[PDB]
Amino acid sequence: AQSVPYGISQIKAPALHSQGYTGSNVKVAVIDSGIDSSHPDLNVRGGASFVPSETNPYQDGSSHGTHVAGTIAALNNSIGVLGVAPSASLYAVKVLDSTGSGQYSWIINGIEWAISNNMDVINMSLGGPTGSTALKTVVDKAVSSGIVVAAAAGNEGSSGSTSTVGYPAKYPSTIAVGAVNSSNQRASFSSVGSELDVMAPGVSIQSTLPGGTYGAYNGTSMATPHVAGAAALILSKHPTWTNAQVRDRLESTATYLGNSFYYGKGLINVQAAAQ
Ligand SMILES: [Ca+2]
Ligand SMILES: [Ca+2]
């Protein structure tokens, strides 16, 4: 039997599914540690690896890319879980190795691939404390080219009034995504600051793991794919909307949760966004 993880329902994805919108034909690049393309609850349409030691993007030694992929697009069937956008076209863009880390050159090469291959949405469930002008240039290029770029805000918690949002989420061109639990409470680890844009479910998120199994993780990396999947739902209903329009709807229609420094505009609501 299939289960619907709570976060899928919490962002109101099932309302879109009932309208007949499931992300069909929307191309979503998971820029991460690979995706296990053999998982029975995933359909990976293509991909590319930019990790020199791991030339197969369709294998994931970390688990993170596969987990994120399932939150975006786990198939609607008799098994496993259900993604936000279960008909979306998934692409495995491997820029992190089996340890879950990668060089900025590798990440940049993955983003360039996504641009060249006309992706609609990029999910970057990754981040770090240091900027790079090369990274900002390619992220901004992706956005200018029309791609929705969702990025994990980071898991650095709070530190008084200091922003703890990491890169590339800190850049204005990305949607920086923080984490709430099933009660819409901010997770203590969720990064904060002026750059934080929206929240999504990021605590005890059940998804696909390599080898055909499932399990729960915590992090803003689990929140991010809810937003990437939501963007794919919106584009499946509104195929002419630009990335800027999709982003403005996701942010503006969010359920306000409190102080924007901690919550941004609040919890995404894809039903309201896609109206
Ligand atoms: Ca399933
Ligand atoms: Ca941002």
Any descriptors?
hydrolase, binds calcium ion, Rossmann fold, seven-stranded parallel β-sheet, two-stranded antiparallel ribbon
Structural write-up:
By secondary structure, this protein is α/β, with parallel strands linked by helices. The chain has one domain (1-275): Peptidase S8/S53 domain (Rossmann fold), CATH 3.40.50.200. It contains nine helices and nine strands. The protein has helices spanning 6-10, 13-19, 64-73, 104-116, 133-144, 220-237, 243-252, 260-263, 270-273; strands spanning 27-32, 44-49, 89-94, 121-124, 148-152, 175-180, 198-201, 205-209, 213-217. The strands form two sheets. The chain has a seven-stranded parallel sheet, with helices on both faces. It has a two-stranded antiparallel ribbon with strand order 8-9. Helix 3 (64-73) runs parallel beside helix 6 (220-237) and helix 4 packs parallel to helix 5. It is globular. The two termini are 31 Å apart. The chain binds calcium ion (2 copies). Residues 2, 41, 74-75, 77, 79-82 line the site of one calcium ion (CA). Monomer. Its cofactor is Ca(2+). It catalyses: Hydrolysis of proteins with broad specificity for peptide bonds, and a preference for a large uncharged residue in P1. Hydrolyzes peptide amides. Belongs to the peptidase S8 family. Residues 5-274 form the Peptidase S8 domain.
- How are the strands of the largest sheet arranged? 2-3-1-4-5-6-7
Q: What percent of residues adopt helix (DSSP H or I)?
A: 25-40%
Number of strands: 9
Could you state the CATH homologous superfamily? Peptidase S8/S53 domain
Largest sheet: 7 strands, parallel
What is the CA-atom radius of gyration, in angstroms? 16 Å
Strand share of the residues?
Answer: 15-25%
Count of the separate structural domains? 1
Name the shape in a single word: globular
Name every ligand kind in the structure.
calcium ion
